[PDB]
Design a protein around this ligand. Structure first.
Ligand SMILES: N#Cc1c(NC(=O)c2cccc3ccccc23)sc2c1CCN(C(=O)CCN1CCCCC1)C2
Length: 331
């Protein structure tokens, strides 16, 4: 037998014998994740368990798409897999999928908590931006970039771990919507620069150490957007479908704040001329990314040109989903 079973968390990991010394890394919406030693490569790996991915269409659509897109994508800032396996011997038996990647060290969340540094922040934004340009080039608009699904290594190398949305489950686990663009909040149709808003959000949070646009749901979240950035002006409303337009036009109006008050110089270092300049460039980039109207928001190409950044330059049953996924594993 080429697998063995072991009781991490309150889960069972049945993994190939090559992977030893399993220890819990963490848990998202998608699966349980363990650190392990890989004896064949003689290095450290992370292994994610997907328990019955085909249990509903959401879990299943996602699982299938992330397996196909991983194989077929290739960039240093986007997950790539070392290995994919199931311990189960037949389609009839099939239950769980295991995905193996090189071990990364931290979440972006833990990085956003660290004091502001211009070399690090710019290099991370550069990488998030090159990753996204890679996704957009391959036909992939993410639409749900959030720091929980972005990982980094001690040497500041960065990878995006998921491919976002395509196009309900009875589970109390709640999705993070804080980084979603206005055109996602308001159901508006979108293009590539939808992902710039989310990078803007992570960047603002790195400076402010507070989620910019929190809320119980999109009602709250929209209030937070308008009262800091102000009510969008007239000609953005005109691309809002009739019902959304009514609601957006009837919230209490806000002037909005200038970026200097939104991100005071007090949040940055001012100990050198270099840091003074980097501070005004950072805020200039934020001001170009946290733009409600996507027609006026900066593109991914313009952002990787910005001087803060450029120093670095579809309907199946669950029986049918089970097979599709099993096939792509074995293949
Ligand atoms: N390395 C790594 C790694 C992840 N990887 C995966 O999610 C993952 C592993 C294998 C294959 C995968 C395939 C597709 C998506 C994700 C995949 S997820 C994750 C990491 C490493 C840093 N992480 C942590 O949250 C660790 C630090 N936490 C601090 C807060 C309390 C708990 C400990 C999150």
């Amino acid at each position: 037998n080429q697998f063995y079973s072991v009781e991490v968390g309150d889960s069972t990991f049945t993994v190939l014998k090559r992977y030893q010394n399993l220890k819990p890394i963490g848990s998202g919406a998608q699966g349980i994740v363990c650190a392990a030693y890989d004896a064949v490569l003689d290095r450290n790996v992370a292994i994610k368990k997907l328990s019955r991915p085909f249990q509903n269409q959401t879990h299943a659509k996602r699982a299938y798409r992330e397996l196909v897109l991983m194989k077929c994508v290739n960039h240093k800032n986007i997950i790539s897999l070392l290995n994919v396996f199931t311990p189960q011997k037949t389609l009839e038996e099939f239950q769980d999928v295991y995905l193996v990647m090189e071990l990364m060290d931290a979440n972006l969340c833990q990085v956003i908590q660290m004091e502001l540094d211009h070399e690090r922040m710019s290099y991370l934004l550069y990488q998030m931006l090159c990753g996204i340009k890679h996704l957009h080039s391959a036909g992939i608009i993410h639409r749900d970039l959030k720091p929980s699904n972005i990982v980094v290594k001690s040497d500041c190398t960065l990878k995006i771990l998921d491919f976002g949305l395509a196009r309900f489950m009875m589970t109390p686990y709640v999705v993070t919507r804080y980084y979603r663009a206005p055109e996602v909040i308001l159901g508006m149709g979108y293009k590539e620069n939808v992902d710039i808003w989310s990078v803007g959000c992570i960047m603002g949070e790195m400076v402010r150490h507070k989620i910019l646009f929190p809320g119980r749901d999109y009602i709250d979240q929209w209030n937070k957007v308008i009262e800091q950035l102000g009510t969008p002006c007239p000609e953005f409303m005109k691309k809002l479908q009739p019902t959304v337009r009514n609601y957006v036009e009837n919230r209490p109006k806000y002037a909005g704040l200038t970026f200097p008050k939104l991100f005071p110089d007090s949040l940055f270092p001012a100990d050198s001329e270099h840091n003074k300049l980097k501070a005004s460039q950072a805020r200039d980039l934020l001001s170009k990314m946290l733009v409600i109207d996507p027609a006026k928001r900066i593109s991914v190409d313009d952002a990787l040109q910005h001087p803060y950044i450029n120093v670095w330059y579809r309907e199946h049953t669950i029986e049918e989903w089970k097979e599709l996924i099993y096939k792509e594993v074995m293949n």
